[PDB]
Amino acid sequence: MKVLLLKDAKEDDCGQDPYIRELGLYGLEATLIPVLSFEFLSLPSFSEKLSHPEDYGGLIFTSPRAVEAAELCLEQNNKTEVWERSLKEKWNAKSVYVVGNATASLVSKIGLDTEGETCGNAEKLAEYICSRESSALPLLFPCGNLKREILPKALKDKGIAMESITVYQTVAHPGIQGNLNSYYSQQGVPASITFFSPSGLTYSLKHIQELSGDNIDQIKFAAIGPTTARALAAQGLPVSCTAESPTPQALATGIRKALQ
């Protein structure tokens, strides 16, 4: 029995995506089609702000995408020398805040000082920043699309100066239609499709409908968690399985029972 995972991205745990590998333990042939992609934005502007630390009180990074954008805007605008020559240490004398273990690793990688997050998430960082005095110069926050960011309003509500710059945006993976086309043409309608977020559902459901035609009723739809399940229900799809926890093991258990 073939199963399809529509997940944000293919992960790599010692050579394989752990969700696909786990299903494989049980004779379940799983395929992953990614539903999220990203694009970088405003890197020249970001390079200019980076080259003027005297105008800022510090930096906030909450995503590896933003640190990647930093690396990228330095290379592209000829500021690599200067970063290593007169920027890195200038910015390191200021305050550098990080959320995310992956973010923190990259922050270490470009020189800034580091010692990881010490914030588990945006809301806890916001509390930490607001419990202390702040600089009269704004904190620079290279970020994602403003609609998903909560830091800008959390800090401003407590009087903290900040300047946000969107340097990456999350988008529907532009291969979804083609990848689903190829899968169904080669493999046929899958026994099960698992969604990993409401977004993924939004970006892929119409194509799944068109490809599945009237066989959609035979597909066992699975959700990695209740929020995703609720999004499934909202589109009126029956939820055959909701993983008890969002892990490869709990998904495989679910899919296996649903397919018995």
Residues 213 and 237 reside in one and the same domain: yes
Domain match, 159 and 202 both: no
CATH number at residue 161: 3.40.50.10090
**Number of structural domains, the chain?**
2
Q: Do 19 and 145 sit in the same domain of this protein?
A: no
Resolution of this structure in Å: 1.8
* Residues 231, 237 contacting (CB under 8 angstroms): no
Same domain, residue pair 157 and 202: no
**Where among 155, 175, 195 does a domain terminate?**
175
CB burial string 187-221: b at 16+ within 10 A, e below: eebbbbbbbbbbbbbebbbebbeebbeeeeeebbb
Q: Long-range contacts made by residues 222-225, C-beta under 8 angstroms, separation at least 24?
A: 222/192, 222/193, 222/194, 222/195, 222/251, 222/254, 222/255, 222/258, 223/194, 223/195, 224/7, 224/194, 224/195, 224/196, 224/197, 224/251
Pick from 24, 11, 15: which is nearest to 3 by CA? Answer: 24
* Same-domain status, 5 and 111: no
> Cα separation of 233 and 45, whole Å?
43
Q: Are residues 56 and 167 in the same domain?
A: yes
**Residues of the domain holding 191:** 1-35+176-260
Q: Could you tell me if 202 and 129 lie in one domain?
A: no
Token match 């296996």: residue? 256
How far apart CA 95 and CA 92 sit, in angstroms, is: 7
My answer on whether 100 and 204 are in the same domain is no
Pair (140, 230) in one structural domain: no
Both tokens assigned to 127? 């509390």
* Residue 185 · residue 177 · CB < 8 Å: no
Question: Does one domain contain both 106 and 159?
Answer: yes
Domain end among 123, 144, 175: 175
Q: Which of the listed residues 132, 155, 175 is the one where a domain comes to its end?
A: 175
Q: CB under 8 Å to 205, separation ≥6 — which residues?
A: 235, 237
The pair of structure tokens assigned to 189 is 């309608």
251 and 212 within one domain: yes
